[PDB]
Nucleic acid binder design. Structure first.
Length: 92
DNA sequence: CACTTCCGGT
DNA sequence: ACCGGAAGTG
């Protein structure tokens, strides 16, 4: 469609320490955490033109990435996901 | 296409 | 919180 993709949006946030308040790399091996899921969802909505966006819908988008091998869940760790760069590369 | 909505189930 | 099927939006 041309619109910005979620993975790009998240990498941009994660590439700036200024955003550690809501999202940051943590744990290691591509692991990151949404330290403020509501905030991240708000930014995503605003950035995407979907004002009724929330973590419920955002996380669903993240889960959609599971099948694409672009991301996976850190099982048992609240709000903690894992970026798969090899998978991202294989998608290109 | 790449999500966004919705929501019953774990 | 997290999962994931199914139908809908730009």
């Amino acid at each position: 469609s041309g619109q910005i993709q979620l993975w790009q949006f998240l990498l941009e946030l994660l590439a700036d320490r200024a955003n550690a308040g809501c999202i940051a790399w943590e744990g290691g091996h591509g692991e990151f955490k949404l330290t403020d899921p509501d905030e991240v969802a708000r930014r995503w909505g605003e950035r995407k033109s979907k004002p009724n966006m929330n973590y419920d819908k955002l996380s669903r988008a993240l889960r959609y990435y599971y099948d694409k091998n672009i991301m996976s869940k850190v099982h048992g760790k609240r709000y903690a996901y894992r970026f798969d760069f090899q998978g991202l590369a294989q998608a290109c």
